[PDB]
Amino acid sequence: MDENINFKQSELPVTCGEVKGTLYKERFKQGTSKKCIQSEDKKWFTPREFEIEGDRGASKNWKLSIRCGGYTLKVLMENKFLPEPPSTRKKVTIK
């Protein structure tokens, strides 16, 4: 059902510790398996390499270290914004 962050724009706004960025759908299909976030340094980073620049690197969990439009990847992967293997099921809490 989505909310306010439409990924149909080919570009999804991300924010890792105030470190905003541009997410590319062409690679988003893999998430942490393909760098689709372009930083002001004119370079693409992976949800992990980005967590290092936004947080520090010891954050470990990148699904929480980075946000997207409002909700982190952890939630974005829990609602529907991101594909990934069977998230959970139906009638699940949190959108």
Side-chain angles (χ1 to χ4, degrees):
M1 249 166 233
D2 314 284
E3 275 241 48
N4 55 357
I5 315 304
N6 209 327
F7 70 101
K8 252 292 117 114
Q9 326 271 279
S10 284
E11 284 197 4
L12 220 56
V14 271
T15 33
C16 174
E18 173 136 47
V19 179
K20 209 182 258 244
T22 3
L23 183 130
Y24 279 60
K25 298 292 139 38
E26 65 193 61
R27 278 163 133 84
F28 179 62
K29 47 176 98 155
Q30 337 249 23
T32 193
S33 204
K34 275 267 153 83
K35 316 213 247 168
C36 43
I37 296 135
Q38 189 182 34
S39 48
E40 251 97 89
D41 265 84
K42 204 71 62 132
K43 144 77 78 199
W44 301 357
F45 285 98
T46 4
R48 156 76 82 188
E49 277 197 78
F50 210 52
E51 164 213 84
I52 283 169
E53 214 92 60
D55 222 295
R56 209 60 68 204
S59 205
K60 208 251 268 215
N61 276 347
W62 53 266
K63 310 104 141 99
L64 303 165
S65 200
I66 309 183
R67 338 202 188 149
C68 203
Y71 308 93
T72 80
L73 286 314
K74 179 100 251 138
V75 183
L76 248 72
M77 81 141 62
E78 205 118 69
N79 29 47
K80 55 246 144 211
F81 293 109
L82 170 102
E84 252 238 318
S87 39
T88 23
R89 244 143 236 145
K90 243 195 205 102
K91 290 119 177 281
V92 193
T93 354
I94 314 301
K95 53 224 100 199

Coordinates of all heavy atoms in Angstrom, one line a residue:
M1 N 0.8 -1.2 0.0 CA 0.0 0.0 0.0 C 0.9 1.3 0.0 O 0.4 2.3 -0.4 CB -0.9 0.0 1.2 CG -2.4 -0.2 0.9 SD -3.3 -0.7 2.4 CE -4.1 -2.2 1.8
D2 N 2.1 1.1 0.5 CA 3.0 2.2 0.6 C 2.5 3.4 1.4 O 1.3 3.3 1.9 CB 3.4 2.7 -0.8 CG 3.7 1.6 -1.8 OD1 4.8 1.1 -1.7 OD2 2.8 1.3 -2.6
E3 N 3.2 4.5 1.6 CA 2.8 5.6 2.3 C 3.0 6.9 1.5 O 2.1 7.3 0.7 CB 3.6 5.7 3.6 CG 3.0 4.9 4.8 CD 2.6 5.7 6.0 OE1 1.9 6.7 5.8 OE2 2.9 5.3 7.1
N4 N 4.1 7.6 1.8 CA 4.4 8.8 1.1 C 5.6 8.8 0.2 O 5.9 9.6 -0.6 CB 4.5 10.0 2.1 CG 5.5 9.7 3.2 OD1 6.1 8.6 3.2 ND2 5.8 10.6 4.1
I5 N 6.4 7.7 0.5 CA 7.7 7.5 -0.3 C 7.4 6.5 -1.4 O 7.5 5.3 -1.3 CB 8.8 7.0 0.6 CG1 8.8 7.8 2.0 CG2 10.1 7.1 -0.1 CD1 9.0 9.3 1.8
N6 N 7.2 7.1 -2.6 CA 7.0 6.3 -3.8 C 8.3 6.0 -4.5 O 9.1 6.9 -4.8 CB 6.0 7.0 -4.8 CG 5.2 6.1 -5.6 OD1 5.7 5.0 -6.0 ND2 4.0 6.5 -6.0
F7 N 8.5 4.7 -4.7 CA 9.8 4.3 -5.3 C 9.6 4.2 -6.8 O 10.6 3.9 -7.5 CB 10.2 2.9 -4.8 CG 9.3 1.8 -5.2 CD1 9.6 0.9 -6.2 CD2 8.0 1.6 -4.6 CE1 8.8 -0.1 -6.7 CE2 7.2 0.5 -5.0 CZ 7.6 -0.3 -6.0
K8 N 8.4 4.5 -7.3 CA 8.2 4.5 -8.8 C 8.9 5.7 -9.5 O 8.8 5.8 -10.7 CB 6.7 4.6 -9.0 CG 6.1 3.3 -9.5 CD 6.6 3.0 -10.9 CE 7.4 1.7 -11.0 NZ 6.7 0.6 -11.7
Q9 N 9.6 6.5 -8.7 CA 10.3 7.7 -9.3 C 11.7 7.3 -9.7 O 12.5 8.1 -10.1 CB 10.3 8.8 -8.2 CG 9.1 8.9 -7.4 CD 8.0 9.7 -8.0 OE1 8.0 11.0 -7.9 NE2 7.0 9.1 -8.6
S10 N 12.0 6.0 -9.5 CA 13.4 5.5 -9.9 C 14.4 6.0 -8.9 O 15.5 5.4 -8.9 CB 13.7 5.9 -11.3 OG 13.1 5.1 -12.3
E11 N 14.1 7.0 -8.1 CA 15.1 7.5 -7.2 C 14.4 7.7 -5.8 O 13.4 8.5 -5.7 CB 15.6 8.9 -7.6 CG 16.6 8.8 -8.7 CD 17.5 10.0 -8.9 OE1 17.3 11.0 -8.1 OE2 18.3 10.1 -9.9
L12 N 14.9 7.0 -4.8 CA 14.4 7.1 -3.5 C 15.3 7.8 -2.5 O 16.5 7.5 -2.4 CB 14.1 5.6 -2.9 CG 12.8 5.5 -2.1 CD1 11.6 5.9 -2.9 CD2 12.7 4.0 -1.7
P13 N 14.8 8.8 -1.8 CA 15.6 9.6 -0.9 C 16.0 8.8 0.4 O 15.1 8.3 1.1 CB 14.7 10.8 -0.5 CG 13.3 10.3 -0.7 CD 13.4 9.3 -1.9
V14 N 17.3 8.8 0.6 CA 17.8 8.1 1.8 C 18.5 9.0 2.7 O 19.0 10.1 2.3 CB 18.8 6.9 1.4 CG1 18.0 5.6 1.2 CG2 19.6 7.3 0.2
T15 N 18.6 8.7 4.0 CA 19.3 9.5 5.0 C 20.0 8.7 6.1 O 19.3 8.2 7.0 CB 18.3 10.5 5.7 OG1 17.0 9.8 5.8 CG2 18.2 11.8 4.9
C16 N 21.3 8.6 6.0 CA 22.0 7.8 6.9 C 22.8 8.7 7.9 O 23.8 9.3 7.6 CB 23.0 6.9 6.2 SG 24.2 6.0 7.4
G17 N 22.2 8.9 9.1 CA 22.8 9.8 10.1 C 23.1 11.2 9.5 O 24.2 11.7 9.5
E18 N 22.0 11.8 9.0 CA 22.1 13.2 8.4 C 22.8 13.1 7.1 O 22.9 14.1 6.4 CB 22.8 14.1 9.4 CG 23.1 15.5 8.8 CD 22.7 16.6 9.7 OE1 23.1 16.5 10.9 OE2 22.1 17.6 9.3
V19 N 23.3 11.9 6.7 CA 24.0 11.8 5.4 C 23.0 11.4 4.4 O 23.0 10.2 4.0 CB 25.1 10.8 5.6 CG1 25.8 10.6 4.2 CG2 26.1 11.2 6.6
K20 N 22.3 12.3 3.9 CA 21.3 12.1 2.8 C 21.9 11.5 1.6 O 23.2 11.5 1.4 CB 20.6 13.4 2.5 CG 19.1 13.2 1.9 CD 18.5 14.5 1.6 CE 17.5 15.0 2.6 NZ 16.1 15.0 2.1
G21 N 21.1 11.0 0.7 CA 21.6 10.4 -0.6 C 20.5 10.0 -1.5 O 19.3 10.1 -1.2
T22 N 20.9 9.6 -2.7 CA 20.0 9.2 -3.8 C 20.0 7.8 -4.1 O 21.1 7.3 -4.5 CB 20.2 10.0 -5.1 OG1 21.3 10.9 -4.9 CG2 19.0 10.9 -5.4
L23 N 19.0 7.0 -3.8 CA 18.9 5.6 -4.0 C 18.4 5.3 -5.4 O 17.4 5.8 -5.9 CB 18.0 4.9 -3.0 CG 17.9 3.4 -3.1 CD1 18.2 2.8 -1.7 CD2 16.6 3.0 -3.6
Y24 N 19.1 4.4 -6.1 CA 18.7 4.0 -7.5 C 18.0 2.7 -7.5 O 18.5 1.7 -6.9 CB 20.0 3.9 -8.4 CG 20.5 5.2 -8.9 CD1 20.9 6.2 -8.0 CD2 20.6 5.4 -10.3 CE1 21.3 7.4 -8.5 CE2 21.1 6.6 -10.8 CZ 21.4 7.6 -9.9 OH 21.9 8.8 -10.4
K25 N 16.8 2.7 -8.1 CA 16.0 1.4 -8.2 C 16.7 0.4 -9.0 O 16.5 -0.8 -8.7 CB 14.6 1.8 -8.7 CG 13.8 2.7 -7.9 CD 13.4 2.1 -6.6 CE 13.6 3.1 -5.4 NZ 13.2 4.5 -5.8
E26 N 17.4 0.8 -10.0 CA 18.1 -0.2 -10.9 C 19.0 -1.1 -10.1 O 19.3 -2.2 -10.6 CB 18.9 0.6 -11.9 CG 20.1 1.4 -11.3 CD 20.7 2.3 -12.3 OE1 20.0 3.2 -12.8 OE2 21.9 2.2 -12.6
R27 N 19.4 -0.7 -8.9 CA 20.2 -1.5 -8.0 C 19.5 -1.9 -6.7 O 19.8 -2.8 -6.0 CB 21.5 -0.8 -7.7 CG 22.6 -0.9 -8.8 CD 23.6 0.1 -8.7 NE 25.0 -0.5 -8.9 CZ 25.6 -0.7 -10.0 NH1 24.9 -0.4 -11.2 NH2 26.8 -1.2 -10.1
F28 N 18.5 -1.1 -6.4 CA 17.7 -1.3 -5.1 C 17.2 -2.7 -5.1 O 16.9 -3.2 -4.0 CB 16.6 -0.3 -5.1 CG 15.7 -0.4 -3.9 CD1 16.2 -0.2 -2.6 CD2 14.4 -0.7 -4.0 CE1 15.4 -0.3 -1.5 CE2 13.6 -0.8 -2.9 CZ 14.1 -0.6 -1.6
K29 N 17.0 -3.3 -6.2 CA 16.5 -4.7 -6.3 C 17.4 -5.7 -5.5 O 17.0 -6.8 -5.2 CB 16.4 -5.1 -7.7 CG 17.6 -4.9 -8.6 CD 17.5 -5.4 -10.0 CE 17.1 -4.4 -11.0 NZ 17.5 -4.7 -12.3
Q30 N 18.6 -5.2 -5.2 CA 19.5 -6.0 -4.4 C 19.8 -5.4 -3.0 O 20.4 -6.1 -2.2 CB 20.8 -6.2 -5.2 CG 20.7 -6.0 -6.7 CD 20.9 -7.3 -7.5 OE1 20.7 -8.4 -7.0 NE2 21.2 -7.1 -8.8
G31 N 19.5 -4.2 -2.9 CA 19.7 -3.5 -1.6 C 21.2 -3.4 -1.2 O 22.0 -2.8 -1.9
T32 N 21.5 -4.1 -0.1 CA 22.9 -4.1 0.4 C 23.8 -4.9 -0.5 O 25.0 -5.2 -0.1 CB 22.9 -4.7 1.8 OG1 24.2 -4.4 2.4 CG2 22.6 -6.2 1.8
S33 N 23.3 -5.3 -1.7 CA 24.1 -6.1 -2.6 C 24.5 -5.3 -3.8 O 25.2 -5.8 -4.7 CB 23.4 -7.4 -3.0 OG 24.2 -8.4 -3.4
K34 N 24.1 -4.0 -3.8 CA 24.4 -3.1 -4.9 C 24.3 -1.7 -4.5 O 23.3 -1.2 -4.0 CB 23.4 -3.4 -6.1 CG 23.8 -4.5 -7.0 CD 24.7 -4.0 -8.2 CE 25.6 -5.1 -8.7 NZ 24.9 -6.0 -9.7
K35 N 25.5 -1.0 -4.7 CA 25.5 0.4 -4.3 C 24.7 1.3 -5.2 O 25.0 1.5 -6.3 CB 27.0 0.9 -4.3 CG 28.0 -0.1 -3.7 CD 29.2 0.6 -3.1 CE 30.4 0.4 -3.8 NZ 31.5 1.3 -3.4
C36 N 23.6 1.8 -4.6 CA 22.7 2.6 -5.4 C 22.5 4.0 -4.8 O 21.7 4.8 -5.2 CB 21.3 2.0 -5.6 SG 20.7 1.2 -4.1
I37 N 23.2 4.3 -3.7 CA 23.1 5.5 -3.0 C 24.2 6.5 -3.3 O 25.4 6.2 -3.0 CB 23.0 5.3 -1.4 CG1 21.8 4.5 -1.0 CG2 23.1 6.7 -0.7 CD1 22.1 3.4 0.0
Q38 N 23.9 7.5 -4.0 CA 24.9 8.5 -4.4 C 25.0 9.6 -3.4 O 24.0 10.3 -3.2 CB 24.5 9.1 -5.8 CG 25.6 9.9 -6.4 CD 25.3 10.5 -7.8 OE1 24.1 10.8 -8.0 NE2 26.2 10.7 -8.7
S39 N 26.2 9.8 -2.9 CA 26.5 10.9 -1.9 C 27.0 12.1 -2.6 O 27.3 12.1 -3.8 CB 27.5 10.4 -0.9 OG 28.6 9.8 -1.5
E40 N 27.0 13.2 -1.9 CA 27.5 14.5 -2.4 C 28.9 14.4 -3.0 O 29.4 15.3 -3.7 CB 27.5 15.6 -1.3 CG 26.4 16.6 -1.5 CD 25.2 16.3 -0.7 OE1 25.1 16.8 0.5 OE2 24.3 15.6 -1.2
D41 N 29.6 13.3 -2.7 CA 31.0 13.1 -3.2 C 30.9 12.5 -4.5 O 31.9 11.9 -5.0 CB 31.7 12.2 -2.2 CG 32.6 13.0 -1.2 OD1 32.0 13.4 -0.2 OD2 33.8 13.2 -1.5
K42 N 29.8 12.5 -5.2 CA 29.6 12.0 -6.5 C 30.1 10.5 -6.6 O 30.8 10.1 -7.4 CB 30.4 12.8 -7.6 CG 29.8 12.7 -9.0 CD 28.5 13.4 -9.1 CE 28.6 14.9 -8.8 NZ 27.9 15.7 -9.9
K43 N 29.6 9.7 -5.6 CA 30.0 8.3 -5.5 C 28.9 7.5 -4.9 O 28.1 8.0 -4.1 CB 31.3 8.2 -4.7 CG 31.3 7.0 -3.8 CD 31.7 5.7 -4.7 CE 33.1 5.6 -5.0 NZ 33.4 4.7 -6.2
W44 N 28.7 6.3 -5.4 CA 27.7 5.4 -4.9 C 28.2 4.5 -3.7 O 29.3 4.0 -3.8 CB 27.2 4.5 -6.0 CG 26.6 5.2 -7.1 CD1 26.4 6.6 -7.3 CD2 26.1 4.7 -8.4 NE1 25.9 6.9 -8.5 CE2 25.6 5.7 -9.2 CE3 25.9 3.4 -8.8 CZ2 25.1 5.5 -10.4 CZ3 25.4 3.2 -10.1 CH2 25.0 4.3 -10.9
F45 N 27.4 4.3 -2.7 CA 27.8 3.5 -1.5 C 26.7 2.5 -1.2 O 25.5 2.7 -1.6 CB 27.9 4.4 -0.3 CG 29.2 5.2 -0.2 CD1 29.2 6.5 -0.6 CD2 30.4 4.6 0.2 CE1 30.4 7.3 -0.6 CE2 31.6 5.3 0.2 CZ 31.5 6.7 -0.2
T46 N 27.1 1.4 -0.6 CA 26.2 0.3 -0.3 C 25.6 0.6 1.1 O 26.2 1.2 1.9 CB 26.8 -1.1 -0.3 OG1 28.2 -0.9 -0.6 CG2 26.2 -2.0 -1.3
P47 N 24.4 0.1 1.4 CA 23.7 0.3 2.7 C 24.7 0.1 3.9 O 24.5 0.6 5.0 CB 22.6 -0.8 2.7 CG 22.3 -0.9 1.3 CD 23.5 -0.7 0.5
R48 N 25.8 -0.7 3.6 CA 26.8 -0.9 4.6 C 27.9 0.2 4.6 O 28.2 0.8 5.7 CB 27.4 -2.3 4.4 CG 28.8 -2.5 5.0 CD 28.8 -2.6 6.5 NE 28.5 -4.0 6.9 CZ 28.2 -4.4 8.2 NH1 28.3 -3.5 9.1 NH2 28.0 -5.7 8.4
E49 N 28.5 0.4 3.4 CA 29.5 1.4 3.3 C 29.0 2.8 3.6 O 29.7 3.7 4.0 CB 30.1 1.4 1.9 CG 31.1 0.3 1.6 CD 31.9 0.6 0.4 OE1 32.8 1.4 0.4 OE2 31.7 -0.1 -0.6
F50 N 27.7 2.9 3.5 CA 27.0 4.2 3.8 C 26.8 4.3 5.3 O 26.9 5.4 5.9 CB 25.6 4.2 3.1 CG 25.2 5.6 2.7 CD1 26.0 6.5 2.0 CD2 23.9 6.1 3.1 CE1 25.6 7.8 1.7 CE2 23.5 7.4 2.7 CZ 24.4 8.2 2.0
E51 N 26.5 3.2 5.9 CA 26.3 3.2 7.4 C 27.6 3.6 8.1 O 27.6 4.2 9.1 CB 26.0 1.8 7.8 CG 26.1 1.5 9.3 CD 26.5 0.1 9.7 OE1 27.8 -0.2 9.6 OE2 25.7 -0.7 10.0
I52 N 28.7 3.3 7.4 CA 30.0 3.7 8.0 C 30.3 5.2 7.9 O 30.8 5.8 8.8 CB 31.2 3.0 7.2 CG1 31.3 1.5 7.6 CG2 32.5 3.7 7.4 CD1 32.2 0.7 6.7
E53 N 29.8 5.8 6.8 CA 30.0 7.3 6.6 C 28.9 8.1 7.4 O 29.2 9.2 7.8 CB 29.9 7.6 5.1 CG 30.7 8.8 4.7 CD 32.1 8.4 4.2 OE1 32.2 7.6 3.2 OE2 33.1 8.8 4.8
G54 N 27.7 7.5 7.6 CA 26.7 8.2 8.3 C 26.8 8.0 9.8 O 26.7 8.9 10.6
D55 N 27.0 6.7 10.2 CA 27.2 6.4 11.6 C 28.7 6.4 12.0 O 29.2 7.4 12.7 CB 26.6 5.1 11.9 CG 25.8 5.1 13.2 OD1 26.4 5.3 14.3 OD2 24.5 4.9 13.2
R56 N 29.4 5.4 11.6 CA 30.8 5.2 12.0 C 31.4 3.9 11.4 O 32.5 3.9 10.9 CB 31.0 5.3 13.5 CG 32.4 5.9 13.8 CD 32.6 7.3 13.3 NE 31.7 8.3 14.0 CZ 31.3 9.4 13.4 NH1 31.8 9.7 12.2 NH2 30.5 10.2 14.1
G57 N 30.6 2.8 11.6 CA 31.0 1.5 11.1 C 30.7 0.5 12.1 O 30.6 -0.7 11.8
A58 N 30.7 0.8 13.4 CA 30.4 -0.1 14.5 C 28.9 -0.3 14.7 O 28.5 -1.1 15.5 CB 31.1 0.4 15.8
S59 N 28.1 0.4 13.9 CA 26.7 0.3 14.0 C 26.2 -1.1 13.7 O 25.2 -1.6 14.3 CB 26.0 1.3 13.0 OG 24.7 1.6 13.5
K60 N 27.0 -1.8 12.9 CA 26.6 -3.2 12.6 C 25.4 -3.3 11.7 O 25.4 -3.6 10.5 CB 26.5 -4.1 13.8 CG 26.9 -5.6 13.6 CD 25.6 -6.4 13.6 CE 25.4 -7.0 15.0 NZ 24.8 -8.4 15.0
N61 N 24.2 -3.1 12.4 CA 22.9 -3.1 11.7 C 22.8 -1.9 10.8 O 22.6 -0.8 11.3 CB 21.8 -3.2 12.7 CG 21.5 -4.6 13.1 OD1 22.0 -5.6 12.5 ND2 20.7 -4.8 14.2
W62 N 22.7 -2.1 9.5 CA 22.6 -1.0 8.5 C 21.1 -0.7 8.2 O 20.8 0.3 7.8 CB 23.3 -1.4 7.2 CG 22.9 -2.7 6.6 CD1 23.5 -3.9 6.8 CD2 21.7 -3.0 5.8 NE1 22.8 -4.9 6.2 CE2 21.7 -4.4 5.5 CE3 20.7 -2.2 5.3 CZ2 20.8 -5.0 4.8 CZ3 19.7 -2.8 4.5 CH2 19.8 -4.2 4.2
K63 N 20.3 -1.7 8.5 CA 18.8 -1.6 8.3 C 18.2 -0.5 9.2 O 17.1 0.0 9.0 CB 18.1 -2.9 8.6 CG 18.8 -4.1 7.8 CD 19.6 -5.0 8.7 CE 19.4 -6.4 8.4 NZ 20.6 -6.9 7.5
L64 N 19.0 -0.2 10.3 CA 18.5 0.8 11.2 C 19.4 2.1 11.2 O 18.9 3.2 11.5 CB 18.5 0.3 12.7 CG 17.7 -1.0 12.9 CD1 18.1 -1.7 14.2 CD2 16.2 -0.7 12.8
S65 N 20.6 1.9 10.7 CA 21.5 3.0 10.6 C 21.1 4.0 9.5 O 21.5 5.2 9.6 CB 23.0 2.5 10.4 OG 23.9 3.5 10.7
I66 N 20.5 3.5 8.5 CA 20.0 4.3 7.4 C 18.5 4.4 7.3 O 17.8 3.5 7.6 CB 20.6 3.8 6.0 CG1 22.1 3.5 6.1 CG2 20.2 4.7 4.9 CD1 22.7 3.1 4.8
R67 N 18.0 5.6 6.9 CA 16.6 5.8 6.7 C 16.3 6.1 5.2 O 17.2 6.3 4.4 CB 16.2 7.0 7.6 CG 17.1 7.3 8.7 CD 16.4 8.1 9.8 NE 17.3 8.6 10.8 CZ 17.1 9.7 11.6 NH1 16.1 10.4 11.3 NH2 18.0 10.0 12.5
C68 N 15.0 6.0 4.9 CA 14.6 6.3 3.5 C 13.2 7.0 3.5 O 12.2 6.4 3.7 CB 14.4 4.9 2.8 SG 14.6 5.1 1.0
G69 N 13.3 8.3 3.3 CA 12.1 9.1 3.2 C 11.5 9.3 4.6 O 10.8 10.4 4.8
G70 N 11.7 8.4 5.5 CA 11.2 8.5 6.9 C 11.4 7.3 7.7 O 11.8 7.3 8.8
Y71 N 11.2 6.1 7.1 CA 11.4 4.8 7.7 C 12.7 4.2 7.3 O 13.1 4.3 6.1 CB 10.2 3.9 7.4 CG 8.9 4.5 7.7 CD1 8.2 5.2 6.7 CD2 8.3 4.4 9.0 CE1 6.9 5.7 7.0 CE2 7.1 5.0 9.3 CZ 6.4 5.6 8.2 OH 5.2 6.2 8.5
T72 N 13.4 3.5 8.2 CA 14.7 2.9 7.9 C 14.5 1.7 7.0 O 13.3 1.3 6.7 CB 15.4 2.4 9.2 OG1 14.8 1.2 9.6 CG2 15.3 3.4 10.3
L73 N 15.5 1.1 6.5 CA 15.5 0.0 5.6 C 14.9 -1.2 6.3 O 14.2 -2.1 5.7 CB 16.8 -0.4 5.0 CG 17.4 0.5 3.9 CD1 16.3 0.8 2.9 CD2 17.9 1.8 4.6
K74 N 15.1 -1.3 7.6 CA 14.6 -2.4 8.4 C 13.0 -2.4 8.3 O 12.4 -3.5 8.2 CB 15.0 -2.2 9.9 CG 14.4 -3.3 10.8 CD 15.5 -4.3 11.1 CE 15.2 -5.6 10.5 NZ 16.4 -6.2 9.9
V75 N 12.4 -1.2 8.4 CA 11.0 -1.1 8.2 C 10.6 -1.2 6.8 O 9.6 -1.8 6.4 CB 10.5 0.2 8.8 CG1 9.0 0.3 8.8 CG2 11.0 0.4 10.3
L76 N 11.4 -0.6 5.9 CA 11.1 -0.6 4.5 C 11.1 -2.0 3.9 O 10.4 -2.3 2.9 CB 12.1 0.3 3.7 CG 11.6 1.6 3.1 CD1 11.3 2.6 4.2 CD2 12.6 2.1 2.1
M77 N 11.8 -2.9 4.6 CA 11.9 -4.3 4.2 C 10.9 -5.1 5.0 O 10.6 -6.2 4.6 CB 13.3 -4.8 4.5 CG 13.5 -5.2 6.0 SD 14.4 -6.8 6.2 CE 16.0 -6.3 5.4
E78 N 10.2 -4.4 5.9 CA 9.2 -5.1 6.7 C 7.8 -4.7 6.2 O 6.8 -5.5 6.4 CB 9.3 -4.6 8.2 CG 8.7 -5.6 9.2 CD 9.8 -6.2 10.1 OE1 10.2 -5.4 11.0 OE2 10.1 -7.4 10.0
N79 N 7.6 -3.6 5.5 CA 6.3 -3.2 5.0 C 6.1 -3.8 3.6 O 5.4 -4.7 3.4 CB 6.2 -1.7 5.0 CG 7.5 -0.9 4.9 OD1 8.3 -1.3 4.0 ND2 7.7 0.1 5.7
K80 N 6.8 -3.2 2.6 CA 6.6 -3.6 1.2 C 7.5 -2.8 0.3 O 7.8 -3.3 -0.8 CB 5.2 -3.5 0.8 CG 4.6 -2.1 1.0 CD 3.5 -2.0 2.0 CE 3.5 -0.8 2.8 NZ 3.0 -1.0 4.2
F81 N 8.0 -1.7 0.7 CA 8.9 -0.8 -0.1 C 10.0 -1.6 -0.7 O 10.4 -1.4 -1.9 CB 9.5 0.3 0.7 CG 8.4 1.3 1.2 CD1 8.0 1.4 2.5 CD2 7.8 2.2 0.3 CE1 7.1 2.3 2.9 CE2 6.9 3.1 0.7 CZ 6.5 3.1 2.0
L82 N 10.5 -2.6 0.0 CA 11.6 -3.4 -0.5 C 11.2 -4.9 -0.7 O 10.5 -5.4 0.2 CB 12.8 -3.4 0.4 CG 13.9 -4.4 0.1 CD1 15.1 -3.7 -0.6 CD2 14.4 -5.1 1.4
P83 N 11.6 -5.6 -1.8 CA 11.2 -6.9 -2.0 C 11.8 -7.9 -1.0 O 11.2 -8.1 0.1 CB 11.8 -7.2 -3.4 CG 12.8 -6.2 -3.6 CD 12.4 -5.0 -2.9
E84 N 13.0 -8.5 -1.3 CA 13.6 -9.4 -0.4 C 12.8 -10.6 -0.1 O 11.6 -10.6 -0.4 CB 13.9 -8.7 0.9 CG 15.4 -8.4 1.1 CD 16.0 -9.0 2.4 OE1 15.3 -9.0 3.4 OE2 17.1 -9.6 2.3
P85 N 13.4 -11.7 0.3 CA 12.7 -13.0 0.6 C 11.5 -12.8 1.5 O 11.3 -11.7 2.1 CB 13.7 -13.8 1.3 CG 15.0 -13.3 0.8 CD 14.8 -11.8 0.6
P86 N 10.6 -13.8 1.7 CA 9.4 -13.7 2.5 C 9.7 -12.9 3.8 O 10.2 -13.4 4.8 CB 9.1 -15.2 2.8 CG 9.6 -15.9 1.6 CD 10.7 -15.1 1.1
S87 N 9.2 -11.7 3.8 CA 9.3 -10.8 5.0 C 8.7 -11.4 6.2 O 9.4 -11.7 7.2 CB 8.7 -9.4 4.7 OG 7.5 -9.6 4.0
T88 N 7.4 -11.7 6.2 CA 6.7 -12.3 7.3 C 5.4 -13.0 6.8 O 5.4 -14.2 6.5 CB 6.3 -11.3 8.3 OG1 6.3 -10.0 7.8 CG2 7.3 -11.3 9.5
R89 N 4.3 -12.3 6.7 CA 3.1 -12.8 6.3 C 2.0 -11.7 6.1 O 2.3 -10.6 5.8 CB 2.6 -13.9 7.3 CG 2.5 -15.3 6.6 CD 2.9 -16.4 7.6 NE 4.0 -17.2 7.1 CZ 4.9 -17.7 7.9 NH1 4.9 -17.5 9.2 NH2 5.9 -18.4 7.4
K90 N 0.8 -12.0 6.4 CA -0.3 -11.1 6.3 C -0.8 -10.6 7.7 O -0.4 -11.3 8.7 CB -1.5 -11.7 5.6 CG -1.8 -10.9 4.3 CD -3.2 -11.3 3.8 CE -3.3 -11.1 2.2 NZ -3.2 -12.4 1.5
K91 N -1.5 -9.5 7.8 CA -2.0 -9.0 9.1 C -0.8 -8.7 10.0 O -0.9 -9.0 11.2 CB -3.0 -9.9 9.7 CG -4.3 -10.0 9.0 CD -4.6 -11.4 8.5 CE -5.9 -11.5 7.8 NZ -7.0 -11.6 8.8
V92 N 0.3 -8.1 9.5 CA 1.4 -7.8 10.3 C 1.4 -6.3 10.8 O 0.9 -5.5 10.1 CB 2.7 -8.0 9.5 CG1 3.9 -8.0 10.4 CG2 2.7 -9.4 8.8
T93 N 1.9 -6.1 12.0 CA 2.0 -4.8 12.5 C 3.0 -3.9 11.8 O 3.8 -4.4 11.1 CB 2.2 -4.8 14.0 OG1 2.3 -6.1 14.5 CG2 1.2 -4.0 14.8
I94 N 2.9 -2.6 12.1 CA 3.9 -1.6 11.5 C 3.7 -1.6 10.0 O 3.6 -2.6 9.3 CB 5.3 -2.0 11.8 CG1 5.5 -2.3 13.3 CG2 6.2 -0.8 11.4 CD1 5.0 -1.2 14.2
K95 N 3.7 -0.3 9.5 CA 3.5 -0.1 8.0 C 4.8 0.4 7.4 O 5.8 0.4 8.1 CB 2.3 0.8 7.7 CG 2.4 2.1 8.5 CD 1.1 2.5 9.1 CE 1.0 2.2 10.6 NZ -0.4 2.1 11.1

